[PDB]
Symmetry: C5
Subunit: 345 residues, 5 copies
């Protein structure tokens, strides 16, 4: 019979009185909007800005009894996105947008379908710049959790209620990678139900668990700083009398410990509180620092003054042979207490 | 009875003569607009640009006797954001915007309610890029104060007056963090009342006190530069005669003091005036610098010329044993006078 | 006769009933849209963001029997881009846009031609910010593959079908360069045919193979780190007794191995998993590290204690003459196993 | 009587024939538009891009005899910014915009007042990204001058003439700071009067003098590089025979002179011509370079060959005692000629 | 008589049938559009993105016999930019835009004049982000050529033809500087005449020759790396027996050669192929590398074993006195062959 574009103008026009500024079931029960998203892209998790951008589909389903039809034979319709302003749509927004936009390439990326009984499917495509607060206390060994919450804006709880559908509430695209994190397959789903001095506004959220990878920070920041500490211990096996050899090994080890730490401030984030990589790069500075102060003691005792010249030279060898075993044992005690308290947490 | 969207077109149309270009109470008392904000997001406090961005709600309440109604039974209404251009709204703007924008995702994030007596509630959602001038004289030990002021633009003092409401004038969202600062729970509220050659324009402002965290700059910039100064003092306990050991300890300590300072210019801001971290990294350069000039004196006196060869070698040991105690005492006097004058301020 | 702009208003107006919201061949066979692109610009392949931008022409051809004409004499027409909203156009979009826009400089860069039988040519100009996931396991020796896929949005498989034309489906502009990659002349063309819970949506894609150039990373990151390992081997030819000469060569070689690696973290990407350049810069750290621990053994055996003073000094020369040949042989075995497993892959 | 919004529609409508596309005083004298600006924000003076952004008010005053009224009683009016397109406005633009925009937060930030005799006040709020060419020949000791010029675009000299008003032509906001510069209170005001092949177009400009602060570059780039040169002179007081002590002091001083210069390339701008900080960091490299070549002469003469073994060892001490006094005297002559020629200019 | 705005509505209205969608001289000769540009700003030549932005005026002149008038007395008119959509304008675009925009500050920056015979002048103001491929083979000694080409989009060769006018086709603003390049006063002008599978589209282009300045790269990258090579040669004048002095001079010279190269990777571009600065910083690494391997030979021959102890100590002095003259002669041969092949090219 008549084409669907003319059939919807009969259904939504000034005939039949469909006003797009009044929600369905007016002065009655609230509207049960159900939602599910589909994540196309995900990433660029900035940590100075503390945000991440995501590229989603947003599928919304509700019921509208004013749009029920029976004369037209086909079981479903589709409104063109040009005529989309003549339909009541929920005023969904994201409570932590921090900037967002649509996509308008070659067509508005907006889909609208109307079933026969009046169920309405509405699917759009959004780029979000969502903000999640991050906790970089233990920086390589951290688990970040970045939420994504969907409030209503104008309609309160008694007029409009969001729901996650019980059939795949969050799907993720297949070949999706990240430069630093991995995305677990555990999506929490819970209500939040914001209160203001304006009213009870509904909101639903979805939590994403992010686990930071490790293999880069071991190879270039832990293991090289580990080897600089090992090169401090070889002063305790070099002779006592070789005075240019000991202190030439001394400061040039604390120089390369500073050079290791100074160049690595570009790759690390720029927060103003102490990390767990920063405790490692500061305690490993102290062992190189304490490995020279040992020799400042040995050089002073051996130079100190025949019977007494043999007694002091035997006491200075005693503090050497103690420090060969006892001081690498101290570093292993730190190395145990470090990795326990940053894998339990 | 009739739906609220048709009731507002009777109330705002060409019938009843409501013109949206004339403020309420025209040729009479001024309009008492009262305001309060709600901060969703806050951060990215750039210091090269000297600004910070914030994501707020902006609630405005005023009275409009032309919008008073009694026939419609419900105690409140809500205008749809499409029909929002047919209401007088105040021309509020921020005196230090430096760029801003709305959010138009899935609906204009704009709320309008009309009470029965004519009170109007208007709530929108704005991202600001507000500018605050910063004073980095004492850089780690600083308290920044970044204002947020709300002028009127077209209406003068006798027509429109802003007010902070006496019931929660600034609320902040709960789980809100910052990468470098902490946000105190002390919001000042004061008038500013701008004058121009155009007229008296009202404005209200809200001050935010920011306190910079400390723990990163201690662990990687103060304490490592502190340990380099301690490694200068061990030259005074090494023997006088070990000439490659003293100067090999000398310059390699002033090399790692430069290497500590040179790599840290990326994390620091790029202002062109002297900070308090810059005084520390320059005075601690002088103690490493002065620890070698001591040895340049000792090597010259001991080489200088039997009776006189014993007298000079005893004078050069005198200037060593003085400098073992007196020069670390000088550094503690600087270390007292530094931290006093940057914690009193 | 009559001008073509007035002839198209007769063809597309309310006369003849051409509605731009109904696809051609409605309630019949699907529409066979055929496509080919023309790449003007290409590049800025970011790897933190994992995307690349491209500037294309997008030529679309389909058939529309409602636009067939015979009265007007000329064999082709051209609709002005102002009147472009009165033509059914396919809702093509890119499945990995991540932001895109048109160009509207001096005229909308949009072309539309209508042939006599009803074939329609439609050519536009788009800047894309397409996203491709990258795999930086073997970072200098990698072959990246960045796809470009073109879904439909609103119309399912039974209504609209995309095709690559069989005559030059992807052309590339002539003098097109890249800062880091080279673009092979092998463009794959395959279907993808997306499924959702909404329906079967057609999509076609084109793969681009990118091969990273090598010559920068050899000259400044492999060859200089190669020469630092060679400067470790000259300690095995310097005398055993020259104790300041050996360890002064020792740590100052592991200092310049760290200095080589620390400054190169700015040019490298910032992923959080181990690369192939990172294995090279860590194993070459171990050979410089192991070249000093050899001397810590030699200095301890030779100092260890006449008959036994000759036996130990001959054993310490034995471990030197073994390490002159055997340890550069170990490095060549690593140097073989490295370049084999990163050129086979 | 009647409200001012309806009185202006009588004044600007199709009644009385006010056409907004014809300037006042048509086919007569030119229009004397007078202007003054008010700088709210100022800064982010980039030097790679060679631009600076500024946030101004722009007040324009002209006369329009068609807008003169006498029936309405009040002495001034105000047109709403929605109805602003029905007024002739000058086509002022900035000759070095390089991008700019308005502000449209909560209302267009646009003001229009009409006096009784026909004087029109028009005030808007603009963010500019104005471009000024910079001359970094003498980089810390420079005085930058960044202009701000306001051409007309369509109207020539005989139709429209800009003027600075004689009452506060440029005001600046009170608490306005900059990260690197200071803004002098000397605003030049002069005409520029652009010619083209199109016609004489009027323009007025305002010069701003910027003076770069100094205190950061002294503390971290001049004074530390000054101390490295002083540590070269202590080789001339260390003994001649201590051969590892002299060259160990030699290269480790030219290493820390390179380390000082290499890390400072991030803070400096990236121009491709020689600065004044670059002459300092290159000449101070030569004094450390020449302080070792002195010892290469001393070590060769003293090793050169009893009577002649005493003569050469007395000649090598002669070139030492000359270089103790004469070479720090040469550096002071450079230090005089440097600071004179970069403070006169 | 009647004002010009009403005279153009008679000339362009539905009276006289001027349709703005049909080019002048329809079904006849093509339109001879002539063009010339005026460059206001120029710069920010990025090399990672391989583009540059420019701020131009764009003057277009063509003839339109439908706009010829004789009744109105004045010899020229000017259409207001609001009524600008009622004029046929050429669909000029730039073939390498990569993003562009107009300027709409206080008025659309668009000019239109109509002469009496029908010549039309049209001048607009555009910011371009034009893309030019760059060839950084010889990086400091390069001459870049960045084109600027102006295609037609919809009209083919037989309908519209672009021309450069024979009277000043490209003017440049007077005080125009660049941070790294200089702009020669030699503007090439040639046709390009693009072909597609769509048709012959006209295009004209203008080449700009850019010559990179040199003075920064000499003072801080060539001359300092030159002096490090000179400090290698002083080992050949220091005594053979001073074993800590030679290798302490050895590695600390190859450390500062790496430190010179490592810090300079931030200022250099990030291409992935070998430059000419990279050949210099790698060959100058080899001379410092080869200056130590000489001493590894000398220390091994002199230690090798009375008659034979005199013969080897005289052979090791022979290889020293050869290397004092012969090896700085080798570096000058490289220094000749380097600067010849990078100034001929
Ligand atoms: C939307 O969902 C809510 C809850 O799922 C429904 O509200 C309840 O509906 C049942 C039967 O109509 C009543 O027994 C309850 O009293 C209602 N309230 C609550 C709090 O449970 C509501 O009917 C649904 N509305 C529509 C249009 O489906
Ligand atoms: C808006 O607030 C101001 C001050 O709160 C009111 O102005 C005063 O109103 C009282 C009584 O009407 C007078 O006694 C005063 O003379 C007024 N002026 C001042 C400076 O105090 C004003 O009435 C309020 N307007 C509305 C509509 O509420
Ligand atoms: C579009 O292309 C498809 C396939 O190329 C066509 O569909 C087939 O058309 C032939 C003859 O009309 C039939 O025998 C087939 O049964 C059709 N289906 C399939 C799956 O092959 C279709 O006709 C084309 N439509 C137009 C307007 O050209
Ligand atoms: C705008 O200002 C100019 C100059 O200030 C005026 O032009 C002069 O006006 C006086 C008297 O009208 C004449 O004697 C001069 O011959 C005019 N020209 C010059 C070059 O001085 C002009 O009248 C003013 N126009 C308006 C509307 O105020
Ligand atoms: C536009 O310029 C072209 C060439 O300058 C003109 O085309 C030629 O015009 C002359 C005389 O009209 C003919 O002899 C030639 O045969 C034409 N073609 C060529 C290829 O030279 C054209 O006439 C001009 N059109 C207008 C409106 O000026």
């Amino acid at each position: 019979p008549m084409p669907p574009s003319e059939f919807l103008d009969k259904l939504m026009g000034k005939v039949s009185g469909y006003d797009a500024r009044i929600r369905p079931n007016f002065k009655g029960p609230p509207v049960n909007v159900t939602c599910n998203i589909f994540i196309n892209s995900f990433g660029s998790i900035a940590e100075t800005t503390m945000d991440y951008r995501v590229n989603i589909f947003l599928r919304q389903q509700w019921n509208d009894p004013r749009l029920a039809y029976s004369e037209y034979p086909d079981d479903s319709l589709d409104l063109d996105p040009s005529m989309l302003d003549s339909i009541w749509k929920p005023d969904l927004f994201f409570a932590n947008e921090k900037g967002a936009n649509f996509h308008e390439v070659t067509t508005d990326n907006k889909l609208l379908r109307i079933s026969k009984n009046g169920n309405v499917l509405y699917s759009i495509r959004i780029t979000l710049v969502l903000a999640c607060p991050m906790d970089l206390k233990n920086f390589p060994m951290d688990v970040q959790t970045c939420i994504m919450q969907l409030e209503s804006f104008g309609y309160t709880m008694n007029d409009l209620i969001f729901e996650w559908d019980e059939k795949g509430a969050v799907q993720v695209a297949d070949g999706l990678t990240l430069p630093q994190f991995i995305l677990k397959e555990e999506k929490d789903l819970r209500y939040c139900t914001k209160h203001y001095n304006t009213g009870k506004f509904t909101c639903i959220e979805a939590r994403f668990h992010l686990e930071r990878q490790m293999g880069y920070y071991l190879i270039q920041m832990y293991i090289p700083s580990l080897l600089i500490v090992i090169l401090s211990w070889v002063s305790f096996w070099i002779n006592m009398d070789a005075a240019p050899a000991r202190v030439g090994l001394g400061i040039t080890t604390v120089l390369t410990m500073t050079t290791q730490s100074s160049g690595s401030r570009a790759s690390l984030p720029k927060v103003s509180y102490v990390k767990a990589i920063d405790i490692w790069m500061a305690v490993c500075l102290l062992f190189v620092f304490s490995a020279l102060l040992e020799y400042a003691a040995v050089n002073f005792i051996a130079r100190q003054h025949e019977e007494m010249r043999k007694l002091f030279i035997s006491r200075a060898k005693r503090i050497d042979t103690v420090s060969r075993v006892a001081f690498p044992l101290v570093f292993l005690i730190f190395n145990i207490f470090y990795w326990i308290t940053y894998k339990i947490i």
